Amino acid sequence: AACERALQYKLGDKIHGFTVNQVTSVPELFLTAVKLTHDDTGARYLHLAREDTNNLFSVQFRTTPMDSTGVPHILEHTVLCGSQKYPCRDPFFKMLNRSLSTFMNAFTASDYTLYPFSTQNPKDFQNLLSVYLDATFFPCLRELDFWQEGWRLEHENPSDPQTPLVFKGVVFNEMKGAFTDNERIFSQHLQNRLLPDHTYSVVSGGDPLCIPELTWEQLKQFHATHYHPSNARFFTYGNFPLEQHLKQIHEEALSKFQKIEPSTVVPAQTPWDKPREFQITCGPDSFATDPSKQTTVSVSFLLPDITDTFEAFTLSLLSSLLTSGPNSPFYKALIESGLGTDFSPDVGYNGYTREAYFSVGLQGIVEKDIETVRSLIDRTIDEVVEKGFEDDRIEALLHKIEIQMKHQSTSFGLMLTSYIASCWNHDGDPVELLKLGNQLAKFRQCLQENPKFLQEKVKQYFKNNQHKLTLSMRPDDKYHEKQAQVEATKLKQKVEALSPGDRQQIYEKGLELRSQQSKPQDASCLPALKVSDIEPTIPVTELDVVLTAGDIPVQYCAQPTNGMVYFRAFSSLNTLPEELRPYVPLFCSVLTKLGCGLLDYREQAQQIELKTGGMSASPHVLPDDSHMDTYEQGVLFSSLCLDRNLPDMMQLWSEIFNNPCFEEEEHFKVLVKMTAQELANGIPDSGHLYASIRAGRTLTPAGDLQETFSGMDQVRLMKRIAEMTDIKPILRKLPRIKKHLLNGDNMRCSVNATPQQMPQTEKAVEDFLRSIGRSTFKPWQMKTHFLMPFPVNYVGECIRTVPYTDPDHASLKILARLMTAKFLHTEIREKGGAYGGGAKLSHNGIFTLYSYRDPNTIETLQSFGKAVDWAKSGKFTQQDIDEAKLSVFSTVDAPVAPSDKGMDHFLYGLSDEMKQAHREQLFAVSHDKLLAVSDRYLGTGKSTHGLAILGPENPKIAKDPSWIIR
């Protein structure tokens, strides 16, 4: 096994130029941690050897910007457009089709950047590790790649010099979209204000007004100073041997550098002595939203540095105690006070920065109450100092921590790297941060030996700490108007300062960039795989449906879930009246948080968090793979629990079915308002999803109903519901849904658990099931534009293909991945400047066309017209089809955690006879078939086309009478 061998490194062993410094076991996580340092370049290596296939490698570079120009983000964003060993254009989004990797993506945060990737096939791991090593340590920083990828000047047509020069770029629109997010605006301003001393004072992502002050030479110097491997943290996770990683790294990249000192350390923020206060302004509230109540307030403190692991542990626990749940002091003080609608952005602990900053505050309040809120918060802290915390809540919190320690996930390496990145960015020993068990034992001991421990901590960091702050934000109806005007003024200031020779230079450089883009060029220099590497057969999983008292089919699975238990239960909806369908999402939202039998919502929530590890309920619409318009709707009462707490949880579920409290009204108002706000916030960050859903509404009964359950109609409805003052008519609906959905008539349960816990689970599930009651489609074309005050655009469009078992559906899943990887990724992201775009084939058979953060709309609708023409013409080689197969078979074979194998058969009904049937219709894909399927479905007049676009108002779009404006 990986762990046993990995526990066999002796202190002081030289391994391919590395050195052994510390090895430790982590049994609560079942892994082994190894710390190594290179004898010359000083880069740190962390190896988390753990017996899981999906291995991960990540390289980290501390990027400490000193301005808002946005240099570290663009340096990260551009080194994915060539290098020395692979001078081909775009090595990254070409290796997205020459690898079996399930994750391959890169991140950049305030004071660091980090390139991880995780995969399962060792040869593919070696290939992509070489690609990253070369494409970060030795990139050819073409100025034209900076022009394409960062910011540049360009006419409305690089061929015509008679149209004005505007800014273009991908990072530019990326940040425009990122700061379309009011939460992000607030958090950015808060971090800048509370930490104004040093690098956190400036927008490391670059402000959409301060990007143009960045020049190519600055970028090259930032790279030459920051990406030297003395600023390199290497982190690898999984079962592949260590010698491979170290040998490849040392004898590929590290040998060509020498030791420097990375004078980049972020210094401590100076302590204030007087509480401060500020004011920021943001964009308006989406649609019909009362202008009065849109203010936001915070009171954010300053916690110690995260070099001391235990102090940060204790303060994280304390913040969770103070903020989370209807049993927390600030929930009772602030949330139920009737002023706000939710907590503030970044509420609770935030250890992202060098020093943690607790935050707390409302939003949706009226301005005149700000001092009120402040007083509340201040007063509330006082109360805690004189009371403390109820012991049962502490026990529930520790139980939840234990659950999150034990629950097995598919992507453990990614979570480990994204969890230790911040703490290890600042010379902090990361092994100590992995040992949750040791620190929980320490926490229990320290809490027991002194009863007032948490009271003293709250006093020390909330009473006697002067580094407070009180930020307050207000909506401006013309915030983005002002941003556009100042950007236009900056454009004019930058343009008139240019000689005609430089104008001709810009024009010729734009033409050369266009040539470098649209020229069909080579990619053979990169390593790759073959479809002879995709495994031919997948192992089968053991299922055993067991009818239990008396017609309830109850699947079971025996997985190594580490002593945890995963109950699930799908209950249908066919007998429900049609008029109560829209509120079914609301019913599921409030079902598990209103009162169960003899308990009230605070007691029930304390139970739920004491016994289980979460108890949700969320409607699904599952389509059928033997007919186009056959769908099974229904709610999925998922759950989770430790082994011992199994009957208790099950009793809870019975209580939730038999006796839900539909008369607690104040907490229902609170939950409705809070969740409606939470749905109103999210429309930007998932604009393409909403657009695609509204487009595909009219194609499929399943599509229309999924639009009702999660489309824009849902947020519209919830906004209408949280506005009302009389919530009686809505709370009088819930019994009518409980009497149709909380029974055992049309219900199929499921269980995942270790075999040793299988008979006890049999008994408990049967007890629960005995403890419950036992009582033409014509596709049609619609267009729709949603007026949304955003800078960037979100475009959707759908096509109606054939469902899963149809032979043609198999080939389309290669074409859809083919168009994205070759044609759409170029004519949308690299040319149109968007953040993302392409096509997918939904499991139901909807060929959807989407765009993510698109500066333009009509071109993309036309770029989609050129998408079918390019495919129908067959202008792709045979290896291109070999590329798509390698891609899809890295998506279809994405590893599944013990918690869900197999939930596809339980939900969608895919027996391993039908998966292998489809898996071989994909190996049987040839050039002639892609031509045969493309001209059949995607052609004009061959299907129905539903369109939907989210974005700012546009003259041409609003003109066409063939469009609907909403």
Residue numbers in the entry: 32 to 806, 847 to 1037
Tell me, in the authors' exact words, what the paper reports.
Presequence protease (PreP), a 117 kDa mitochondrial M16C metalloprotease vital for mitochondrial proteostasis, degrades presequence peptides cleaved off from nuclear-encoded proteins and other aggregation-prone peptides, such as amyloid β (Aβ). Of the Aβ-degrading proteases, PreP belongs to the chamber-containing protease (crypt-containing peptidase, or cryptidase) family that uses a sizable catalytic chamber to engulf, unfold, and degrade their substrates. PreP-N and PreP-C, in the closed state of PreP, form an enclosed catalytic chamber to entrap and degrade monomeric amyloidogenic peptides, thereby preventing the formation of toxic aggregates. Comparison of the five cryoEM structures derived from the apo- and substrate-bound PreP reveals three key conformational states based on the degree of opening of the catalytic chamber: open (O), partially open (either pO1 or pO2), and partially closed (pC).
We also optimized the conditions for determining the structure of PreP in the presence of a five-fold molar excess of Aβ 1–40 by DSF. Grids were prepared by the chameleon, and a dataset of 3483 micrographs was processed to yield about 175,000 particles from a well-defined 3D class that was refined to a partially closed (pC) state of PreP at 3.3 Å resolution. We define the substrate-bound PreP cryoEM structures as pC state that is slightly more open than the closed (C) state crystal structures of PreP solved in the presence or absence of Aβ6. Aβ- and CS27-bound PreP structures in the pC state are nearly identical to each other and are slightly more open than crystal structures of apo or Aβ-bound PreP6. Similar to the Aβ-bound PreP crystal structure, extra-densities at the catalytic cleft and hydrophobic sites away from catalytic zinc ion within the catalytic chamber of PreP were found when Aβ was present, confirming key substrate-binding sites of PreP. Residues from both PreP-N (aa F123, F124, L127, 135–139, and M206) and PreP-C (aa R900 and Y906) form a catalytic cleft to bind aa18–22 of Aβ. The switch A and C regions in the pO states have lower resolution and higher thermal B factors than the rest of PreP structures. In comparison, the resolution and thermal B factors of these regions in the open and substrate-bound states are not profoundly different from the rest of the protein. The presence of substrate stabilizes switch A, and thus, the residues for substrate binding and catalysis, enabling the catalytic reaction. This suggests that PreP uses substrate-assisted stabilization as a mechanism for substrate catalysis.
